[PDB]
């Protein structure tokens, strides 16, 4: 399968869904009390809920943790998406298990060419709706910052990154805000935006987790 595929129960263990009553965005856990999402997924009482595959069904594998804190990075702007990364508490800790564990923050930023693999839960349709209910994997490479800026000139910034192909086919438009995107075991991405949707040259945008590692280690030990 070249392209979007079914991860495979707990197959990715860091993985998150964040839900209000319906499963909205996706998130990472950091560890046993903390998950980063996007800022742009900042809602109030969220219900964390980890050890998921078929968001629909009770499979038995679940943690359902409600969220006791969110705190949007100091200069996030919802207008540009400029550093869109959050961070949620967790009510109490996560128990880890082989299906339920956390994923590192990265020592240094990923290089262009790196085999990323990118997952969520959200739509597969570059043109129309179609929300599958199995946690969805892509590998892709991160793109050079040329080939990123020249498909949204003037739109991205050093906290920002893409993703995939630039004849499109294959892209996380909608294809689950807020999850994760994972380079060498490390968390380098956060599922952010992407204008059209898998159309030829406009690959995902993602936040450039390795800028931030400062503020969220800062961050989570003082909250
Ligand atoms: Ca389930």
Same mark, same amino acid.
């Given at each position: 399968?070249?392209?979007?595929?079914?991860?495979?129960?707990?197959?990715?263990?860091?993985?998150?869904?964040?839900?209000?009553?319906?499963?909205?965005?996706?998130?990472?856990?950091?560890?046993?009390?903390?998950?980063?999402?996007?800022?742009?997924?900042?809602?109030?009482?969220?219900?964390?809920?980890?050890?998921?595959?078929?968001?629909?069904?009770?499979?038995?594998?679940?943690?359902?943790?409600?969220?006791?804190?969110?705190?949007?990075?100091?200069?996030?702007?919802?207008?540009?998406?400029?550093?869109?990364?959050?961070?949620? %508490? &967790?009510?109490?800790?996560? =128990?880890?298990? *082989?299906?339920? @564990?956390?994923?590192?923050? $990265?020592?240094?930023?990923?290089?262009?060419?790196?085999?990323?693999?990118?997952?969520?839960?959200?739509?597969?349709?570059?043109?129309?709706?179609?929300?599958?209910?199995?946690?969805?994997?892509?590998?892709?490479?991160?793109?050079?910052?040329?080939?990123?800026?020249?498909?949204?000139?003037?739109?991205?910034?050093?906290?920002?990154?893409?993703?995939?192909?630039?004849?499109?086919?294959?892209?996380?438009?909608?294809?689950?805000?807020?999850?994760?995107?994972?380079?060498?075991? %490390? &968390?380098?991405?956060?599922? =952010?935006?992407? *204008?059209?949707? @898998?159309?030829?040259?406009? $690959?995902?945008?993602?936040?450039?987790?390795?800028?931030?590692?400062?503020?969220?280690?800062?961050?989570?030990?003082?909250?």
């Amino acid at each position: 399968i070249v392209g979007g595929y079914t991860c495979g129960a707990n197959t990715v263990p860091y993985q998150v869904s964040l839900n209000s009553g319906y499963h909205f965005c996706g998130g990472s856990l950091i560890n046993s009390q903390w998950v980063v999402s996007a800022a742009h997924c900042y809602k109030s009482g969220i219900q964390v809920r980890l050890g998921e595959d078929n968001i629909n069904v009770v499979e038995g594998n679940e943690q359902f943790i409600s969220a006791s804190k969110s705190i949007v990075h100091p200069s996030y702007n919802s207008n540009t998406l400029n550093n869109d990364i959050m961070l949620i %508490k &967790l009510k109490s800790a996560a =128990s880890l298990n *082989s299906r339920v @564990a956390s994923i590192s923050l $990265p020592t240094s930023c990923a290089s262009a060419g790196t085999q990323c693999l990118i997952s969520g839960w959200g739509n597969t349709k570059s043109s129309g709706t179609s929300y599958p209910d199995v946690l969805k994997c892509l590998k892709a490479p991160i793109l050079s910052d040329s080939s990123c800026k020249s498909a949204y000139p003037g739109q991205i910034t050093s906290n920002m990154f893409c993703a995939g192909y630039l004849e499109g086919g294959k892209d996380s438009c909608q294809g689950d805000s807020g999850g994760p995107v994972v380079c060498s075991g %490390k &968390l380098q991405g956060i599922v =952010s935006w992407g *204008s059209g949707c @898998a159309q030829k040259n406009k $690959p995902g945008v993602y936040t450039k987790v390795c800028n931030y590692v400062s503020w969220i280690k800062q961050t989570i030990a003082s909250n």
